[PDB]
Design a protein around this ligand. Sequence first.
Ligand SMILES: C/C1=C/C[C@H]([C@@H](C)C/C(C)=C\[C@@H](C)[C@H](O)C[C@@H](C)O)OC(=O)CCC[C@H](OC(=O)/C=C/C(C)=C/C(C)=C/C=C/C(C)=C/[C@H](O)[C@@H](O)C[C@H](C)O)[C@@H](C)C1
Lengths: 59, 382
Amino acid sequence: FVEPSRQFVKDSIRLVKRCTKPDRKEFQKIAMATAIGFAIMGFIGFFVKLIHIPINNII
Amino acid sequence: QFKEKVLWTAITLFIFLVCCQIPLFGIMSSDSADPFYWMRVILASNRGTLMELGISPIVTSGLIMQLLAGARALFNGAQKLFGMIITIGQSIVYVMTLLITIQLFVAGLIVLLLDELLGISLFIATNICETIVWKAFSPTTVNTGRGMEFEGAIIALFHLLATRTDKVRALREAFYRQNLPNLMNLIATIFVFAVVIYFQGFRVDLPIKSARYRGQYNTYPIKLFYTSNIPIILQSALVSNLYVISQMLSARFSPVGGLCHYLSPPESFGSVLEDPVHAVVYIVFMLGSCAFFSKTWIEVSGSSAKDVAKQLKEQQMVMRGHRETSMVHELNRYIPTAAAFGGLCIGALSVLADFLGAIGSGTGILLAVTIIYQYFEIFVKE
Ligand SMILES: C/C1=C/C[C@H]([C@@H](C)C/C(C)=C\[C@@H](C)[C@H](O)C[C@@H](C)O)OC(=O)CCC[C@H](OC(=O)/C=C/C(C)=C/C(C)=C/C=C/C(C)=C/[C@H](O)[C@@H](O)C[C@H](C)O)[C@@H](C)C1
């Protein structure tokens, strides 16, 4: 009942040697995509704390 | 769409800002906010009513009525009302341990309209994307034991460098602080993003020549995260943030540190503390239980191996290998391992968002990247 776990780990190392890997161009492409998508929704909370500290000073 | 895809998110931004407001039915400290503290990365972030039980109780109440009807316009219309009365009925006991009706009704109906005519995960994605910038721009505190008005954040060090000399002690203070957002900590939340955006693009590629068309290689990708970080990290959060607050509630109605030896995600730089067996049991949970959630999620949510052959065959697509039906086994050597290991490696990369400690608890900070990718695919699609 450890040989099924042996089968799982040998199947997983057989899988990740079959998968295709992002090496240097598509890695930078998807990193630029998530960087611009994070820079869109990141600064919205920054604008929340820009709008709110006059409102927090008032109330 | 170009204007529509920005306009809908502008509506959702405004209804997330107007539902980033506190009620005025009486003010207390964090006493009714301790159960909603652990549900901060569940829907939205307040110590009060903001977006409590907005859109997902509508869907689960739909699941309850589907289960009753099993064991369209009227159904979809009663969806909003039945999912909206239950959040007010739960805010009754959230007060006892009026404003929220039209607020969460429009918070449900707007995303229902952009999911029907034209975004549940976008709320948590905004909740994490504000958190990374809030923990980077923190100049807002009353003067503590060190600093001027600062929390040791990035703009805090920017306005602290010119007024404070002795950079040799300042670098070790900026690298070894454990109560505030640090400077060595924000490089870890870039390291975890640069590692998980590399592990996101792992996929297995399979060939398909469509039927009666000589050589259209529409290849089909079987991703490593075959199951986006959504339906596993949501399951880890839905077991953790409910068991934690139930252990809060039942211990005071009939333990927080009396039973923490299997609960706590460690967030210490010296992680070989007084309970090193707790780290082992926590890593066994954060691997095995979520990987079991993934392997049990494939066989339910219509994307198993024996169902994806139906979705391939209905599209008039065939493999370029053996027979009309051995396409099941010709990918069933890859689907259950890319569910099991695809649930284990994401658990390991949520562990190493806490063992190092990146910006948060390893749950929302690692599940926010799949919503960025899942909206990237929408943006590149149309
Ligand atoms: C809350 C939610 C959301 C999911 C999406 C959701 C993420 C997607 C989403 C956000 C919107 C969907 C609904 C729409 O599709 C959106 C528009 C765009 O299409 O949804 C859907 O509910 C579909 C799937 C249903 C989901 O069940 C599960 O996930 C169930 C999990 C588990 C743990 C099952 C087990 C193993 C039970 C134990 C069984 C045992 C012990 C059996 C015994 O042995 C028995 O044999 C013998 C005895 C002795 O007699 C629902 C409940 C989850």
